[PDB]
Design a protein around this ligand. Structure first.
Ligand SMILES: NC(=O)C1=CN([C@@H]2O[C@H](COP(=O)(O)OP(=O)(O)OC[C@H]3O[C@@H](n4cnc5c(N)ncnc54)[C@H](OP(=O)(O)O)[C@@H]3O)[C@@H](O)[C@H]2O)C=CC1
Ligand SMILES: NC(=O)C1=CN([C@@H]2O[C@H](COP(=O)(O)OP(=O)(O)OC[C@H]3O[C@@H](n4cnc5c(N)ncnc54)[C@H](OP(=O)(O)O)[C@@H]3O)[C@@H](O)[C@H]2O)C=CC1
Ligand SMILES: NC(=O)C1=CN([C@@H]2O[C@H](COP(=O)(O)OP(=O)(O)OC[C@H]3O[C@@H](n4cnc5c(N)ncnc54)[C@H](OP(=O)(O)O)[C@@H]3O)[C@@H](O)[C@H]2O)C=CC1
Ligand SMILES: NC(=O)C1=CN([C@@H]2O[C@H](COP(=O)(O)OP(=O)(O)OC[C@H]3O[C@@H](n4cnc5c(N)ncnc54)[C@H](OP(=O)(O)O)[C@@H]3O)[C@@H](O)[C@H]2O)C=CC1
Lengths: 325, 325, 325, 325
């Protein structure tokens, strides 16, 4: 295991684990909790912190920014990343047009109280904006020192390749990373497609929702000590998914996986996370945590890593029976 | 109907209707009226506001800028555009030379009290300036964050193509839009030529003078409630056009069109404007208004849109008998 | 005659006559005189004012800058140009290296109290600096808004072409003008070589020393009312040239030319200057003046222009017997 | 001999001798000593001063910066250079990634109290960073005015060529110089490889450790008046090298060289340094000095230069018996 690795083939070194701020900062948890969670993460070697202009309507960014100024950590020791797409109710306040990328990132930076982010991501694809406009815009903010690199999220392999094509044709800067969902019940893209882009154009993979929003911790049957999101304001969809006919099917397999965990001497959450890092293809996994206990338990997945043999992996595949092909 | 659409093939989303500031702001109407007209427009979904360094010798821009700071609307919810060409009596204070484009836009920005405009247009072609110099200059102000995009106005298809040629040869930024005159008595360019540029190089069309400066409202025989421009200082030309042998010919056809309007249950102005939006090729129509009544009547053209059948259109063509070919 | 014309094929319009500041501003004449000379020039339509970082060790630039702020003329109505090369006694304070072009122009701008000059010239060729470095540097200051265009001076046709080559190969900005010496006794370059560059690469010609530092006014035998430079501090070389065996030869021909002048009803200085403007190839002639009388007499050459027939020109050639071939 | 020469084929003129700041400024010597050493160097024509973000943890840069502001020397008369690579204990605080090059140089500039350095070097190769990212980053800081040129150090010929390749393929700025070790016991690279890069891609050579950290002054057997570094904190390696079986072998040859020195009428240090400048291929030699006596003795090597005949050189080769092939 390598705690720090390159994000894709770029020169940006990130910790294999990062702390995100979705649903948490400026929302579910208190600012005191947030400051505690980031300090723990930072003091434990994590240098990657992800946020977005849409999270808690900018509040997540403000909190994140406040913790950074309050703690006084050197900017050069942090790797801050934020996503852009949804930045307001006005028509021109969403998308990947040059206008919103400039205005959006500028706004996030003000809220974050930072001159620049290390990586600015397109939170998702934009059907209404030509790839050229977007790539120039991304290239622009980087040349303006508002960001060091840029990445994509929820983009198809072809779309990412199109970005690369545009960059090479007009001599702009290619994307260095894709933020994809990755957990035992969402594997195809990261396991089959992303490696392809890594070898062809050096694009790295930063994954999110290691526990499927908490579903994989088993907290909805055999879970670890924490709070509940499925029962949070506006997450009726999450509750539905969990209570769905299939929600029960996966919740059943977790029981079998829970076994392997005990057998390995770690919690289910730790198994699931270390599982995401088995991939050499995954540069870093973004953690989600509402309390210090969950965070440290998760950060413990690092230890579960060496004890993950090929047969243990194959055994996992059989239980999940969804290995990508 | 789509209220918001892309300006050409760019990522900039504009309202199908915009409010201009020619003859009005800083001139014909009072600042109080102006603030009232823009607020109405803004509150009704219009995000496109056009001006020019030449309008009322910069006063139009100042008023526009004052309304924006006074109202406090978010910059990211507005799409401001201004034209450059005539910026002073000095020899070097006019044209499309790098010198005037930089100095001109910089001046408009100061008067507008804005860091940048969304689109900066060349108010007209410049015979004395090489296309390369102009395109570099436009590309320059965009890279300097003084503007997000640039467009042309009163340029020929070939000239616009030449701009595009220059941009692709030296890797500069192509124009995204052409501001052309468009109303029932001026159709050829927008109906026949502009679509060609849209498909070939993604150039969009933003039209102006939907009512031919007021002539199409019939206010010079069967017009709507408002004031008179043809009788304004320096518009002797407009009065002449209206009193011309042909001025009477078109004023005659309006009578026939006025019929269709009543039949449709809308005013002549509404018919004429909704007529301009029938085109999928027209990204947005710039309105001209000296009072709140005219503005709301015009903004009503949106409703007249669905009730505009092909036969109604063909019937219009027969009355006008000028359909482009 | 066209009072204003394009500098080369660029979009920058200049007056056929400009006022320079060599030997004069911050040196030979008083600041009061300078302010008077520029005001006269400006009020008479001249918008071109040339200076250099070397002139009076920067004082010329300071004076020029002071007159501009004091008079309050709009920056957009002026065309300021300065040359760079000799900017200090330190090794790295001279040349056309990126370092000196940046530092040199930045210094001139501070002394001039201006954000930018319209044209920055290389005062002369640099053997110790690669053309690429120089062209990038020039391109750089233009993109940084420190200058609008750049030109060369005392460069050979080949050198200018090499600059153009570099610009097109790396997509940098080509030079738009060459500042060459031009008067009845220095003709070859401007009459034979410069036109070639104008047609091939649009390079314009801005000429200097219309009177050969005063020698052509005949003030050293049959001259106009003024002061003496040949007898100034450090111009022993000028005195020598005038007293040279050839100095007498040319001083003899002036006598014959003086005749043609009277015959035309103008002074010798006016003849000589209007002679420089007969060329369509000369965009502008930089005047040198130590007092208001000389300036207005010179500015009068404009009138002598129409009365300059082909036979009068041919008659001049015979007297000079140095027509270029 | 030419006291000032071009650094490689660039336009940057440097003194054949420069003063470095490794081990000295902010460390071994006092700030008073430092100010004295730089003043001597400056007053003697040296305009080249090298430092690094790693030297004395930034203190070297601070001292250097303080001397510069205190003395008030014109920025345009100095050639400041610093190296980037090791800038902190955090993972992302080292390397040649865009992130560290920007943050690192920005930090050095703050400590140096300067807007820019003349040349920013990569202190060494980075295996974890793609050449493209590095060259863009270097090109970026130059375009941002944080540096005038950039160079490499401890890079292989191939690596330097790869940088050049990247620059020409994406139209970025190539490196102008390589900082290589060079003294009588380290010759291969500077004598055989560097000339190759100079002719092929104009890369110049700036050498360091003319005395092999002091070993060549003979101060460890027959040395000049000064202090001892081999016995300094953390230089156990240097002491070891000197006491090594080979340390004695070279220390033996010095005895023979010491002879030639007396015969030439100069000190061993002077011989060794002037030896480094015999090369037309070496643009400049960076001196190391802990006191004014060493500095002036070294600066004296300039005089030893003319008295260095081919036979004297050949005689040196025989004693060293390591001439490159
Ligand atoms: N680019 C994109 O499209 C997206 C990126 N992301 C990134 O990834 C992060 C999101 O991960 P998220 O998706 O929130 O979640 P995870 O899948 O990592 O689940 C974290 C949630 O699971 C619960 N949990 C965590 N650890 C434990 C534990 N040890 N025991 C029990 N329960 C535990 C908590 O639930 P509770 O709160 O109920 O206590 C917590 O909020 C974000 O911060 C963001 O940066 C996320 C979504 C989209
Ligand atoms: N780029 C270019 O070359 C140009 C661009 N434009 C753009 O378009 C806009 C100009 O439109 P304009 O050309 O002024 O005008 P329109 O053709 O839209 O006519 C508006 C005028 O008609 C009258 N009017 C408007 N609505 C009504 C109504 N409902 N009933 C009766 N009369 C009515 C008013 O006359 P009155 O004032 O007499 O009451 C008003 O000033 C500008 O704001 C500008 O941004 C305009 C010209 C050139
Ligand atoms: N780029 C380059 O390499 C160079 C550019 N230049 C440019 O051109 C200008 C230089 O012109 P300069 O070269 O000074 O001179 P000119 O050839 O135009 O001669 C001007 C001088 O002649 C005398 N004079 C002018 N008008 C009259 C008159 N009507 N009657 C009698 N005597 C008269 C004066 O002499 P006195 O002062 O003795 O009274 C005056 O200083 C500078 O300002 C500079 O901008 C100049 C040199 C090099
Ligand atoms: N880019 C890179 O990788 C590197 C670049 N460099 C550059 O070159 C410089 C380093 O040179 P350095 O490598 O320090 O040394 P040198 O080989 O020039 O040796 C200088 C040392 O030798 C002694 N000395 C110097 N002159 C005399 C003399 N006349 N008589 C007796 N002893 C003398 C002193 O030892 P004492 O202190 O013991 O008195 C002094 O510190 C740095 O300043 C740096 O800028 C250096 C290393 C790496």
């Amino acid at each position: 295991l390598q705690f720090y690795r390159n994000l894709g083939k770029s020169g940006l070194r990130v910790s294999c684990l990062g702390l995100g701020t979705w649903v948490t900062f400026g929302g579910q948890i208190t600012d005191e909790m947030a400051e505690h969670l980031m300090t723990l993460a930072y003091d434990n070697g994590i240098n990657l912190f992800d946020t977005a202009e849409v999270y808690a309507a900018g509040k997540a960014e403000v909190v994140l920014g406040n913790i950074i100024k309050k703690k006084g950590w050197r900017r050069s020791s942090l790797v801050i990343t934020t996503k852009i797409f949804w930045g307001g109710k006005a028509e021109t306040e969403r998308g990947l047009s040059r206008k919103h990328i400039i205005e959006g990132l500028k706004a996030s930076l003000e809220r974050l109280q930072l001159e620049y982010v290390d990586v600015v991501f397109a939170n998702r694809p934009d059907p209404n904006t030509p790839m050229e406009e977007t790539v120039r815009a991304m290239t622009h903010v980087i040349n303006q020192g508002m960001a060091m690199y840029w990445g994509t999220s929820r983009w198809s392999s072809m779309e990412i390749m199109e970005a690369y094509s545009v960059a090479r044709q007009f001599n702009l800067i290619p994307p260095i990373c894709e933020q994809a969902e990755y957990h035992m019940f969402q594997r195809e893209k990261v396991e089959v497609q992303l490696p392809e882009l890594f070898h062809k154009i050096g694009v790295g993979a930063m994954t999110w929702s290691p526990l499927a929003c908490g579903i994989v911790s088993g907290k909805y049957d055999s879970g670890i000590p924490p709070y509940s999101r499925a029962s949070l304001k506006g997450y009726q969809w999450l509750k539905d998914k969990i209570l769905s006919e299939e929600g029960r099917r996966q919740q059943a397999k977790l029981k079998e996986l829970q076994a392997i965990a005990e057998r390995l001497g770690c919690t289910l959450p730790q198994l699931a996370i270390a599982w995401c890092l088995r991939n050499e293809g995954v540069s870093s996994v973004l953690l989600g945590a509402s309390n210090a206990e969950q965070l440290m338990e998760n950060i413990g997945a690092i230890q579960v890593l060496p004890k993950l043999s090929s047969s243990i992996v194959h055994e996992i595949d059989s239980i999940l029976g969804n290995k990508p092909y």
